[PDB]
Symmetry: C3
Subunit: 248 residues, 3 copies
């Protein structure tokens, strides 16, 4: 069997919260080294990649590698029945027929379990390439989320301009324009060689920031001509990365 | 006249909150010994019974027994204009023509009063029978409400299974299934002779738990073949009971 | 140029919150002595008057008087991107072509700016007359807002009756009636010579109380036959006044 006990169960609730708007169904790939999901959003625009490593769980067993096709709407609904304090265990027989979620409240007197039916999915097989980035900005996840919420009241698209000493996000539309200038030092840190300037759909960034509760930092990785990576580290465990192509 | 002063006015606000979704109009029966309501829900599915005893009020007068036909939507709207801290008095001349609600804030400088027109209702005359229960579970009202909210994401119907040492609530539907196991000891206490297992519409239980703020305990009384009683004691005053038939 | 720095930026956010439901576009008249707006609501029912005096700003410059036609929906949206803690500056070149709002967070590491296009408006030219009031009631803005919210559940119209020692607000409708009696002393103070009794659309009062966060006091000025003035002082700076004709 597969069995992953997570004492900080809320990590899972939050991971589902951060994917349900983007993806209806995907493979969770289970292996010795942990849990891996890679999928395109349901409109084929961004690509989402999730890593939850073994070590990050309180107990972790995997006897055979599995590819469980999970309906994320369903998993999300079920994770909403877990309390924020609960210990959450994922468990599946190796035939990968159903997935169990078990929620045990800390006062060990209530225990919930849900079994969700798994699907077989034919999934578009994709490989994320080797990529160098001219530019990596690391900033509080809260700020980034507010910038994206704010500019979306102004237009559809944000232009991100990155220099050695600061980053600027701008948009414009019917009502006029806006920008927000952030300076290098919560901490803001820029590592760049080339300066970049790219443009992105605020709609997708707004979905990405559903991940905000997973981490108090977000990292933006950019380079001329290649997708932006918006990464949230799930402390001591892995990351959730979103990939989005610049507009032209 | 009829006059009931309630210093903890919020009890009334909460009682209306716990009935408005279930019942549009009903008789409040006023007598010496207190206030009594018995009515079927507006779809003829569950039966609601309310007791507010004399002693429970700070002052209580009743000179003639009354049967006031009250529109509960109306009474609810008006009770929403009372502050949570207010002293609330119900008052009616014995002709039962209108009902007054008076709300006096504790800083005795603001006083509100509303008069609502009363109706004459022809009401379906019902008698609740003598019943023994194989099984009575007493548990925190909050938990019960969360169980009902949670399982309703899974299916329509909850199967309640009761043993000497614990109770289990299960449901299933399109997305898979769920159950929650609660153990006997907030305190959970089971008094049973026969074990029972019955099934109920989560829709009605969900309405019943609108009563949750009235008490931190709820009591479930069950027996093969007869309606479940979901009871909330209104401390030092009476109870609100809901009755619901098991499905088959 | 025109430039007004406001360290307590939230005053502006709140002023827009208190006008956006009432008015789509209006002239902000800029002069040496401060900022002035006067406009009818978009249905031609009430008149709104705003004063923000020079002295009230931390820095204030005006080199030429301006009449900026501002879309208030737009200004409102943009002011929603300011944090409550931010320092807000209004700035316009004297040609009055666009208006800039600059939001600098207190940790001087983030700075936002928005430019909104200005319009030329042909506006209905009105003069508010000299008026004496029989009656002026000063009361907590919170209470007034609750009275208006509450009575609107009862009817459309509130009858305000004012005596030397107290004020009463009443309404009635389908469900029955209500009144709230407030006594002269939070503080309630009546200055009257003639007693008045007038009736007003609760719809407009409800819009007016969108101003509640600007001040913890509201002042009602009344007189037979003339509009009511609902005034909110914006401490150390000016006022927002709404004018509304009694019904007959
Ligand atoms: N045809 C595919 C989607 O339906 C296109 C696609 C493939 C890949 I691999 C993508 O992911 C990445 C990730 C990092 C990169 O540098 C480039 C593409 C994306 I966004 C879209
Ligand atoms: N930190 C300094 C004030 O103490 C001045 C300052 C402020 C900001 I915001 C900065 O950041 C940016 C970022 C992007 C821009 O386009 C302009 C300034 C810099 I560099 C210096
Ligand atoms: N025909 C009636 C409803 O329209 C049926 C009815 C009558 C009674 I009295 C009920 O109440 C109880 C209460 C306790 C019991 O043991 C049995 C019925 C119910 I639920 C439905
Ligand atoms: N309390 C013990 C752990 O310290 C073990 C335990 C846990 C639960 I939840 C229990 O309750 C139930 C209730 C219903 C069931 O169907 C199964 C266990 C029992 I009995 C013992
Ligand atoms: N025809 C105008 C509106 O479209 C009517 C109008 C004019 C004025 I000046 C008003 O304002 C006041 C303000 C104070 C007063 O004593 C009288 C009118 C109002 I309310 C409506
Ligand atoms: N303050 C006194 C109780 O300590 C009694 C009291 C209460 C109220 I409310 C009052 O106010 C009103 C206001 C309007 C009315 O129509 C009647 C009473 C007065 I004058 C005295």
């Amino acid at each position: 069997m597969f069995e992953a006990r997570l004492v900080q169960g809320s990590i899972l609730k939050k991971v589902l919260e951060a994917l349900k708007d983007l993806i209806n169904e995907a493979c969770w790939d289970i292996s010795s080294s942990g849990v891996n999901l890679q999928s395109m959003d349901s409109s084929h625009v961004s690509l989402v990649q999730l890593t939850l490593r073994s070590e990050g769980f309180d107990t972790y067993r995997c006897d055979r590698n599995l590819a469980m096709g999970v309906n994320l709407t369903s998993m999300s609904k079920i994770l909403k029945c877990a309390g924020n304090e609960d210990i959450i265990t994922l468990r599946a027989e190796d035939n990968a027929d159903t997935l169990a979620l078990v929620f045990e409240a800390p006062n060990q007197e209530k225990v919930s379990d849900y079994e969700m039916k798994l699907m077989d999915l034919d999934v578009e097989q994709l490989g994320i390439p080797e990529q160098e980035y001219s530019c990596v900005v690391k900033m509080p996840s809260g700020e980034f989320a507010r910038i994206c919420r704010d500019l979306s009241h102004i237009g559809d698209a944000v232009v991100i301009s990155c220099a050695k000493d600061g980053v600027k996000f701008s948009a414009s539309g019917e009502l006029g324009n806006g920008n927000i200038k952030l300076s290098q030092t919560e901490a803001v840190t820029i590592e760049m060689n080339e300066p970049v300037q790219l443009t992105f759909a605020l709609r997708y960034l707004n979905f990405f920031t559903k991940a905000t509760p997973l981490s108090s930092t977000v990292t933006l990785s950019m380079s001329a001509d290649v997708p932006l990576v918006v990464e949230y580290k799930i402390a001591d465990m892995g990351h959730l990365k979103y990939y989005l192509a610049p507009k032209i």
